[PDB]
Amino acid sequence: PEGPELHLASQFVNEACRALVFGGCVEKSSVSRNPEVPFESSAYRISASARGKELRLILSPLPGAQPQQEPLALVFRFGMSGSFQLVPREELPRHAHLRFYTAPPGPRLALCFVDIRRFGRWDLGGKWQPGRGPCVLQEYQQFRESVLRNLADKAFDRPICEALLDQRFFNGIGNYLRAEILYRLKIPPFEKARSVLEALQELTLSQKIRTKLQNPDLLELCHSVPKEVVQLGGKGYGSESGEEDFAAFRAWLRCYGMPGMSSLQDRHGRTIWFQGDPGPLAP
């Protein structure tokens, strides 16, 4: 999964669990190799936050809840088939590996982490993945400055398409986004990353409008392009509107997996999509 989905998923969890009160223990499927979740409360709330390709659940016991329980945070990485679903209690998905049950007041619902391929993972604690840079969606300015400040790093010796997948600098950017981003500026996927960014290393609003507005740079699109998907996905995550959502996503794509577009393999075996010249560092 990539940036936008984790953000939309975090949005779905919050709006769905806003008035919901959960109770009991956090159940994990026996087959799952992920860690058990030491947690038990008669009444607790579930909120979510997203950063890059990670989602953080926070379990917060309500005042008066028993037994005594400190708030617990869990960080998730979805993987190929990872997802969060809110389902009726008697209708648990076959591959729900982590479940949260609602308290007696109201219908019996279950917030489940569904993942048939078990590529997903979660870790106890609320700490994000070590070394991952600022979120390109929520922390744009910190993201931009971090990249420019560390241009001398060996990561930018790599071709631009490979550097975009580096979560240490482009946290939230994945396979389809890098294809769409590079396509907008028609930048060859195999140009030296530093070369593409060297020019970017204070203008007034009137000055930015006249020069910077109609000519967005690479880093600007690293934030605005996935932001287009967020405002494309709407409140579709976790709904029955799955079919119509993916239809809008397919129409939004301009390069990735599109007819007429070229495709190569980076050093990681990941397929990069582009149009025209591959670049001086193409294998």
**Sheet with strand 109-114: strands edge to edge:** 27-28, 96-101, 109-114, 83-88
From 2, 54, 162, 180, active-site residue: 2
Task: Mark which of 77, 100, 132 sits at the end of a domain.
Answer: 132
From 1, 4, 188, 189, active-site residue: 1
Question: Within 10 Å of residue 71's Cβ, how many Cβ atoms?
Answer: 14
Is the Cα torsion angle 153, 198, 209, 228 positive or negative in sign?
negative
Distance, CA of 75 to CA of 78 (rounded, Å): 10
Q: 36 Cβ partners below 8 Å, 6+ apart? A: 28
125 with 61, same domain: the answer is: yes
Q: Is residue 283 part of a domain?
A: no
Report the DSSP pairing between strands 54-61 and 83-88: unpaired
CB contact burial 107-139 (16+ within 10 A = b; e otherwise): eebbbbbbbeebebbbeeeeeeeeebbbbbbbb
User: Any idea what the Cα angle at residue 91 is, between residues 88 and 95, rounded to 5°?
Assistant: 115
Q: 34 Cβ partners below 8 Å, 6+ apart? A: 28, 97, 98, 120, 121, 122
Q: Is 53 a catalytic residue?
A: yes
119 with 148, same domain: the answer is: no
18 with 30, same domain: the answer is: yes
70 with 181, same domain: the answer is: no
179 with 214, same domain: the answer is: yes
Distances (CA, A) of 127 to 5, 49, 113, 223, 266: 20, 12, 19, 23, 30
Q: Is 61 a catalytic residue?
A: no
> Resolution, in Å, please?
2.6
Q: Are 175 and 210 in contact (CB under 8 A)?
A: no
Distance, CA of 75 to CA of 155 (rounded, Å): 26
Is the Cα torsion angle 271, 116, 131, 9 positive or negative in sign?
positive
Residue 14 counted as an annotated binding residue: no
CA-derived radius of gyration, the chain: 21
Task: Mark which of 132, 163, 190 sits at the end of a domain.
Answer: 132
Helix axes 218-233, 175-184, angle to 10 degrees: 120
CA distance between the termini of the chain: 26
Q: Are 179 and 263 in contact (CB under 8 A)?
A: no
Distance, CA of 94 to CA of 72 (rounded, Å): 26
Distance, CA of 273 to CA of 179 (rounded, Å): 5
103 with 69, same domain: the answer is: yes
DSSP letters along the chain, please? --HHHHHHHHHHHHHHHSS--EEEE-EE-SS--SPP---EEEEEEEEEEEETTEEEEEEEEPTT-SS----EEEEEE--TT-EEEEEEGGG--TTEEEEEEBPSSSS-EEEEEE-TT---EEEESSPPPTT----TTT-HHHHHHHHHHTTTSGGGGSBHHHHTT-TTTSTT--HHHHHHHHHHTT--TTSBHHHHHGGG----HHHHHHHTSSS--HHHHHHHHHHHHHHHHTT-TTSSTHHHHHHHHHHH-SSTT-TT-EEEE-TTS-EEEESS---TT--
In total, how many domains does the chain have?
Answer: 2
Q: Are 214 and 185 in contact (CB under 8 A)?
A: no
User: And the tokens for 206?
Assistant: 């009137």
Q: Is residue 281 part of a domain?
A: no
Q: Is 1 a catalytic residue?
A: yes
Q: Determine if the peptide bond prior to 259 is cis (ω within 30°).
A: no
Residue 50: closest CA among 233, 177, 227, 172 = 172
From 4, 53, 159, 189, active-site residue: 53
Long-range contacts formed by 138-142: CB under 8 A, 24+ apart? 138/7, 138/50, 138/51, 140/223
109 with 141, same domain: the answer is: no
Task: Mark which of 98, 132, 166 sits at the end of a domain.
Answer: 132
Q: Is residue 280 part of a domain?
A: no
